[PDB]
Amino acid sequence: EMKPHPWFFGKIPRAKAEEMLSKQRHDGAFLIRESESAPGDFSLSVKFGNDVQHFKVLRDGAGKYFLWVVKFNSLNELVDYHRSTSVSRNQQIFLRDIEQ
Ligand SMILES: [Cl-]
Numbered sequence: 001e002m003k004p005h006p007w008f009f010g011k012i013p014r015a016k017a018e019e020m021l022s023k024q025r026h027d028g029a030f031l032i033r034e035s036e037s038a039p040g041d042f043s044l045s046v047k048f049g050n051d052v053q054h055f056k057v058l059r060d061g062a063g064k065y066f067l068w069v070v071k072f073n074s075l076n077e078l079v080d081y082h083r084s085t086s087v088s089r090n091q092q093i094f095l096r097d098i099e100q
Contacts, residue, residue, distance in 0.1 A: 006097050007079060009033045017045040018052040021098075028087075028096040032057070032075055042075065048093050055087060 009017065011034045021029060030046040035056075042057035044067070055067050057075065064071040065078045067087060072078040083095045 005076070005079075006100055007031050008075075011036065014043070014045070014054065017043075017054075021045055021047045021052045022050075024098055026096060026099070028094045029098045030079075030087075030095045031098065032079065044079075044087070046087060046093060046095065048088075048091060053088065053093070 007030060009031045012020075012031075013036055014033075017031055017033050021031065024047045027048050028046060030044060033043055033045060035041045035043045038056075042065075044055045044057055046053050046055070057078070058066050060066070060071055064073060065075055066072070067078070067082070068089070070081060070085070072081060079095060086092045086094060
């Protein structure tokens, strides 16, 4: 073993997520943060080249979480799914833990 997840940053601002992730070397380095613009919703921020991409974590009626189509009972299961299935529809971008 039990360690906390290296990817949960709570209420950091979108810009602070960009600032942090831009220093990461490896595409797919990522975090989950609690949106300021949409309180009570999560956002996923991900290093890609000289950019950081942001995705809304969406919810169905039952409160399951998804980015596109496949949905999960927890943020943890959605994150893990997207380590081996791209988060993006325009590039192959697979979630990988930040270096720390
Ligand atoms: Cl894929």
